[PDB]
Amino acid sequence: KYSKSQIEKAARKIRHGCEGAEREEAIKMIQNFRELHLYPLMLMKNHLDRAAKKVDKENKIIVARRLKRLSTIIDKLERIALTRMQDIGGCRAIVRNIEQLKKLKDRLVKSRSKHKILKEYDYLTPKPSGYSGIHLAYSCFDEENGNNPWSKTKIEVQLRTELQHAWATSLEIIDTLENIKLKTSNEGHPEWRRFFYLSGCLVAHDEGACILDDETIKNYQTELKTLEEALSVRSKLSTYTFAMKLTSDANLKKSLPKNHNGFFLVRMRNAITTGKFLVSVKPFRKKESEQALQELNKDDADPEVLIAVLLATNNIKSLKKAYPNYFGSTNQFGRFLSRHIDTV
Template sequence: MVNEQYQKSKQQLAFSRKQVEKAGRIFRKKEGDFEFATEVIQNYRAAHLYPLTIIKNLVWKHVKKLHLLESATIVRRLKRLPTIIDKLQRETLDGNSDNAINLKRMHDIGGCRVILDSLDHLNELNNSLDSSRTVHSVKSYDYIKHPKATGYRGIHRVYKSYNNLESHDYKGFQIEVQLRTRLQHLWATTVEIVDIIEKETLKTNPKMADTDWKRLFFIMGEFLAVKDGAHQLTQQQTLVYTDELAALNKKLAAFHKLDAFNRAFQLDEIKNKSKNTGFALLVHNTETQEGRVFLYAPNKKQQALTHYAEHEKQTQNNVLLVAGSDLKSIEKAYPNYLNDTSEFLSEFSRILLA
């Protein structure tokens, strides 16, 4: 059964690596055959689904070995086409040097996210993965010991599938595994919510994002890291941050906006239909603030990928294709698309009322 699932997730790369590079250059330079480039990128993205399945199952085995399956959430996803294009066309990725990214070097087209209850569980899983011997090479980025300037925290593990073999059809495909605590995840996904409702770029291009929103999330990141046990604040710093957060909330109407966005999706009708879901296509219309969810059986992968591409052509849509057998786990892992901001708002209130 497992082998059958693996085979169904295989979609071969139909273009050469040089054509993939060319497609990336067309979008980065904004000149050339965009129809060709789009076709290549969509195929290149779809080809990541098989190595993504392999890496996701590697991670799952370690979660199981540590007896964390009951509490951990594991979800995989393919990067949205507009996000890939935006990353190619962005002037800078780090705020300092010019963007010279090559499509082949983009390491998060296929992504697996693991949300864990505590920092201890996160470290256990990361150490367990470090100790494993696989045919895949890996490079780790610790944003807990060294948080990003935005306040983002988590550990990223970038795998190159089958990189330790001489040859393989899927050798070198990069898959990013993100390990986050529940609080780190709430922070990161709420950033994405604000990007949607405020048309900001806090996640994709923080250098160009609104200063007040950036500051609000930096402060929230500090407080949530304290609750996680990953950071400490003095009493004086706590008071200063609390006062600043209250002022920013008043200026931005942050709580009100997030609470309103929380009501955009109505999930009750579809939760009961999700038991045999192989894929879920999440579509959020930024003009009407309405959300739709399309569910596909495990053997309808190609149909899901086709619909994914169709919805992405409509500029008012934010679209995400997620694999998962239970929509409840998707809801936990992607609250930015299913609008469950209640936990973040609860933490926000706790800090302001402390």
């Protein structure tokens, strides 16, 4: 119900501060723009699913869709023009191998629909972050439209392999749970960033997306062994994903308050000196945020506390919704890490 100039003006008015009736109109303008991607998003999820079912007759390629939350869009404008964004709507196809990935990419390219691939982002050679896969940026209803309100809606399609998705899930889990910002920054955490780049490169080599020479492989595994022991990646992935699994537990869910929208203080304790070795989740209310931060910072003094992290229940639920197979993906990345670290 709004014009593209009205939507661009509303995004500007949110970046520039807004209040009251002016804000309600601006948030309605951007919310309208956001739910305009819902139809082409659900459409592209079915177009992609149809292609995946022709590529793998066994129906094992996993297809998913995700619409960026209104809250996430406003926070990006508060803290890349709105109408020029390709990530508002995104689809993801997870295939078993590089062969199956290239077949599905070609099936989508050769296909003839009103939905055009504007750019093909080939990341079979890992990005500086370590990420590998292929992204197809679509302009749905690009030329053939008519009285179509969804003319030129941008939807991104990410094609990735089971191991490339295992790498991406583990990155998202460490990034979100450790509260560090690898994805939304170009600085800090050198050991985490370098660990993800090298492991990403090893994923691309193993998958056959970017084969590296024997010497580089050897050097990359020594670097990886060193980075993994320094950061304790395997131990953290197991603890964080088990703690997330524990939040979805029936006994825990019955003990929690109604529509709990708070925090979970995840810990790993070595009180074995003989004592006990445990992993605990402690829930907090939304009002008890500071009390929760005070308990988290108090554990730095405790030598028994090996892992201590504060998780918002909204971050937990969205990670489980965006990565339904996070338990398995994480374990498959740790097994991958283990087989490269035990080489020499």
